[PDB]
């Protein structure tokens, strides 16, 4: 629900004990933790990993945290297309690799 998410989001704000020293930074950090732990409980073991990969890639996409990447390279990371053409490989390296 939108409504349930809104109550968890607000709860995260009320849990913050910082008094305007570094509230704005610590609040963001506390929200992420608060929302993630709620959803993780809701998720199965196999999916819990998948959801954490999103959150970081979505923070990277929007550039909320500073990371060294390229938009084309993130599209290549999510889906790698196998390109034929070169027959010459190394013995140890697989043909698929």
């Amino acid at each position: 629900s939108l409504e349930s998410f809104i109550t968890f989001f607000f709860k995260a704000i009320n849990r913050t004990t910082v008094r305007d020293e570094n509230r704005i930074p610590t609040l963001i950090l506390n929200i992420r933790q608060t929302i993630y732990q709620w959803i993780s409980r809701g998720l199965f073991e196999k999916h819990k990993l998948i959801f954490l990969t999103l959150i970081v890639f979505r923070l990277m996409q929007k550039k909320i945290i500073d990371v060294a990447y390229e938009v084309a390279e993130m599209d290549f990371l999510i889906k790698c297309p196998a390109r034929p053409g070169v027959e010459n490989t190394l013995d140890w390296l697989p043909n698929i690799s």
């Binding site: 629900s1 409504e3 349930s4 109550t7 968890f8 709860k11 709620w38 409980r41 809701g42 998720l43 199965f44 073991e45 999916h47 990993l49 998948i50 990969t53 999103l54 890639f57 979505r58 996409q61 938009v71 084309a72 993130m74 599209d75 990371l77 999510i78 889906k79 297309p81 196998a82 390109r83 034929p84 027959e87 140890w92 697989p94 043909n95 698929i96």
Partner: protein
């Protein structure tokens, strides 16, 4: 977590949703926590279980619960889909009213479709998954069996029960591996293990001092106890291996449950006669670390799982990845479809299509062969594929650059190209082998190449054929047998195809050998076929798949009676890596090790592994 989550959030109006897996009970954990928070004798709070007719009692309990303020636990919520639509309406009315403070509604249900979206939304979700491991699974198997029943039973019967617990445990760990493992997903419950014990228990009480029959008991475990799950019958032979290795005369003496363990250094054995409490302690210590090798799989078979695991996490993450970066300058789906279209239009696809009339006219039809019949049927299927994909391509290519109505299936093809998944309509045509879109096109042109060499001198069969690149491999095998039946003087039905692995490479110009048919493009998984030895052996650790050399395929009459050879191992061949109802024929190959080892390892042949040169 459950003690924390109730107190910290969902005080009122937000009911708590539990999702339970088989062998897990949410009610046992909540009741303990429930007692510490407030006085809960079972009067104040009611743990109402949802049954038919008890829907009115639950409605009365939840209605009473709101004005009173005591929390109410409901179980087996999925069992009544009509009442959830009714319940939803009651929760919406009570959210607007806002009955008594410190009231909650706990609901627990197996995950299923046709659960109302509204309830799942408003409610907090909490999942409880049991620890996943061979040891953790063996432990859960012994906890299920009542302490006071196992103590009563004598050392002989409890020792063989142990070996069964392991057998049940190892099957759940195989389910985690896709092709290399089972080849199919089958449901296994504790009730199917309990069932098997109760039968075993009776057989020991009858025999008494007289020696127990394993031969009688093992059939039951393979054909009945875990036969009921397996329909395919290839998995059944694998299922019997585990069983045959676990259950034998020497089981009652300390013996390794894991197969062979020649130079593996696990040294995990069945516990000797001792008190029940000592059985669990020994289980926990001796299992210690859980590896693929324990089940009979190769180490590379675990690496291959992390590969299959890794791949799924990115196929999901692709769907989840939102807004497609929100623009900005990456090529659009319709651009990417146009680019692939241009590459296909650059190639002479219309030229690659083979007119049936021209090829039939080249053949005299008096000197025609069974081989010639198979190719003619094969090229027809290819023509029907190649015409369809060119039609779908020239249509979608026209729709991009030309003002025309865009059909729903054509939008899906554009979407499938961007994703680089093989299209659904294309996949249905020709071979069922999953690949990348760029890999498929490269593979398709190698199929087309095999038909081009056929069109020139059709009457003269090529010295080396490639069964890896046919629409039906089986069809070709029936053909090679037909040619032998004309040359020889017995029934075709009697002749069975028998593969023999050859040390010669493609270089050899010798072809059309009397009572023979050459093959190549066979790939062996879960093992390595050494050329020098001339036998199947354990795989190289880092090499996942081992390509076979030139395969010679002879037809010879079946044996009069069922004959079992230790040297010969029967491995199935599959068209795709998936190995799910793509069985073609049983190939035979010579192995110094026992067959039991290889059926347990799961070793099979695959036609297309994407480890094909050029």
């Amino acid at each position: 977590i459950l003690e924390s989550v109730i107190n910290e959030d969902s005080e009122s109006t937000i009911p708590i949703f539990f999702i339970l897996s088989p062998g897990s009970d949410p009610v046992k954990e909540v009741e303990k926590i429930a007692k510490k928070k407030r006085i809960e004798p079972g009067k104040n709070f009611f743990n109402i279980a949802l049954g038919q007719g008890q829907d009115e009692i639950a409605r009365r309990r939840i209605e009473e619960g709101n004005k009173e303020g005591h929390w109410v636990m409901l179980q087996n919520i999925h069992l009544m889909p009509t009442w959830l639509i009714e319940l939803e309406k009651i929760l919406d009315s009570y959210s607007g009213e806002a009955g008594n403070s410190e009231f909650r509604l706990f609901l627990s249900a197996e995950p299923s479709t046709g659960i109302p979206i509204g309830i799942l939304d408003r409610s907090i979700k909490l999942t409880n998954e049991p620890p996943a491991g061979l040891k953790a699974n063996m432990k859960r198997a012994w906890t299920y069996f009542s302490k006071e029943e196992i103590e009563d039973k004598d050392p002989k019967i409890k020792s063989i029960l142990f070996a069964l617990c392991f057998f049940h445990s190892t099957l759940i760990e195989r389910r985690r591996f896709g092709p290399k493992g089972w080849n199919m997903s089958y449901p296994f419950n504790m009730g199917d293990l309990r069932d098997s014990y109760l039968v075993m228990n009776r057989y020991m009480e009858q025999n008494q001092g007289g020696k127990v029959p394993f031969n009688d008991l093992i059939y039951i475990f393979g054909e009945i106890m875990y036969g009921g799950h397996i329909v395919d019958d290839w998995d059944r032979r694998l299922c019997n291996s585990y069983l045959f290795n676990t259950m034998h005369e020497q089981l009652f003496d300390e013996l390794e449950l894991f197969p062979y363990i020649e130079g593996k250094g696990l040294s995990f054995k069945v516990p000797g006669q001792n008190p029940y409490e000592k059985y669990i302690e020994h289980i926990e210590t001796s299992l210690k670390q859980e590896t693929p090798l324990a089940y009979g799989l190769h180490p590379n078979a675990e690496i291959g799982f992390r590969t299959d695991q890794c791949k799924t996490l990115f196929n999901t993450l692709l769907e989840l990845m939102p807004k497609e970066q929100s623009r900005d300058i990456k090529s659009s789906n319709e651009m990417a479809s146009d680019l692939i279209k241009q590459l296909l239009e650059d190639s002479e696809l219309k030229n690659k299509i083979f007119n049936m009339e021209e090829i039939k006219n080249k053949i005299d039809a008096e000197n025609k062969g069974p081989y010639q019949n198979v190719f003619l049927q094969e090229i027809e299927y290819m023509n029907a594929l190649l015409s369809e994909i060119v039609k779908d391509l020239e249509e979608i290519g026209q729709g991009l650059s030309g003002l025309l109505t865009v059909s729903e299936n054509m939008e899906m093809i554009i979407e499938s190209i961007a994703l680089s998944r093989v299209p659904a309509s294309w996949q249905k045509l020709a071979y069922p082998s999953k690949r990348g879109l760029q890999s498929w096109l490269a593979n398709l042109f190698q199929r087309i190449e095999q038909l081009n060499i056929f069109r020139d001198d059709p009457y003269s069969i090529p010295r080396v054929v490639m069964i890896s690149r046919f629409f039906n491999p089986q069809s070709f095998l029936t053909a090679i047998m037909q040619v032998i039946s004309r040359a020889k003087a017995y029934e075709l039905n009697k002749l069975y195809i028998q593969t023999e692995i050859t040390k010669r490479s493609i270089e050899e110009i010798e072809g059309a050998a009397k009572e023979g048919a050459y093959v190549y493009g066979f790939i062996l998984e879960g093992a390595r076929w050494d050329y020098q030895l001339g036998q199947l052996e354990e795989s190289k650790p880092k090499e996942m798949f081992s390509v076979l050399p030139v395969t010679y395929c002879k037809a010879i009459p079946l044996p009069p009676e069922g004959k079992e050879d230790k040297s010969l191992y029967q491995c199935p061949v599959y068209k795709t890596e998936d190995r799910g109802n793509t069985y073609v024929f049983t190939a035979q190959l010579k192995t110094r090790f026992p067959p039991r080892k290889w059926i347990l390892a799961g070793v099979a042949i695959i036609m297309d592994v994407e480890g094909v040169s050029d």
